[PDB]
Design a protein around this ligand. Structure first.
Ligand SMILES: Nc1ncnc2c1ncn2[C@@H]1O[C@H](COP(=O)(O)OP(=O)(O)OP(=O)(O)O)[C@@H](O)[C@H]1O
Ligand SMILES: [Mg+2]
Length: 254
């Protein structure tokens, strides 16, 4: 596994009056630790992860890690073929690794709904899963793939999936306990159980540290966000956006 180091990092989006997508980003994450990244819509959570992978070039500062990454996108995707083929996806088959992954990702119930189990063909002529089941497969695919560093721009966080709590506890927390990983998340339980948390807004880091430090350093912010996890993904992201937007020389009425 690996360590991730960011030091005074600034980047601009090359493709496609506000300029940099990410500004003065500073964090270290120890081997086997979890970073929870939370923040407003368009803060730059996906782009931070892009930058770690090499998809985005920094104009300032250093990025350090081993360079063996598995990335999960926030958009569920499915290749034509079996559920099993979608999780394995060109990677060497191991029955114990696969089983523990599909268990952690809460797919065992879904799979057993089918007569062919995980050998059911998904696609054009086959069957179509719910966006929720497709999210579980997508995370499983990214987690089954072996890596030093796991960038989870989780599809949950923009979905309301009944069994997400179980995914986070079993997969991200326990199955992946010895992996260095980064979870983009809109849930407060995830921030509480993380080793480190990062709050991003308009390209900037408005907080980096632990949940304890957050609760202590910014209590008014904390009390506004920490039953919050019972709200829908769309609603939680709104409240977060609304709250983060107060960090300015105005801050509107509602
Ligand atoms: N490949 C790209 N090329 C150019 N601009 C991009 C690219 N990806 C993202 N951006 C821009 O950078 C800004 C921040 O994007 P990003 O997707 O990182 O936000 P985010 O925090 O992931 O938001 P959300 O929570 O809605 O996913 C956005 O305004 C977006 O238009
Ligand atoms: Mg994103």
């Amino acid at each position: 596994t690996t360590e991730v180091v960011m030091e005074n990092v600034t980047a601009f989006w090359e493709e496609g009056l506000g300029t940099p997508v990410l500004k003065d980003i500073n964090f270290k994450i120890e081997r086997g630790q979890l970073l929870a990244v939370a923040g407003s819509t368009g803060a730059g959570k996906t782009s931070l992860l892009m930058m770690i992978m090499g998809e985005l070039e920094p104009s300032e500062g250093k990025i350090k890690h081993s360079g063996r990454i598995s990335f999960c996108s926030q958009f569920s995707w499915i290749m034509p073929g079996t559920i099993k083929e979608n999780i394995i996806f060109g990677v060497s088959y191991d029955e114990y690794r696969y089983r523990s992954v599909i268990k952690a990702c809460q797919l065992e119930e879904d799979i057993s709904k089918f007569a062919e189990k995980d050998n059911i063909v998904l696609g054009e002529g086959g069957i179509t899963l719910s966006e929720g089941q497709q999210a579980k497969i997508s995370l499983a695919r990214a987690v089954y793939k072996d890596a030093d560093l796991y960038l989870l721009d989780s599809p949950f966080g923009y979905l309301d999936v009944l069994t997400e709590k179980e995914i986070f506890e079993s997969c991200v927390c326990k199955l992946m306990a010895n992996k260095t990983r980064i979870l983009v998340t809109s849930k407060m339980e995830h921030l509480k159980k993380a080793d480190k948390i990062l709050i991003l807004h308009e390209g900037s880091s408005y907080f980096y540290g632990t949940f304890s430090e957050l609760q202590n350093l910014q209590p008014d912010f904390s009390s506004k966000l920490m039953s919050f996890d019972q709200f829908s993904a769309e609603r939680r992201n709104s409240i977060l956006t609304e709250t983060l937007r107060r960090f300015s020389l105005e801050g509107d009425a509602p």
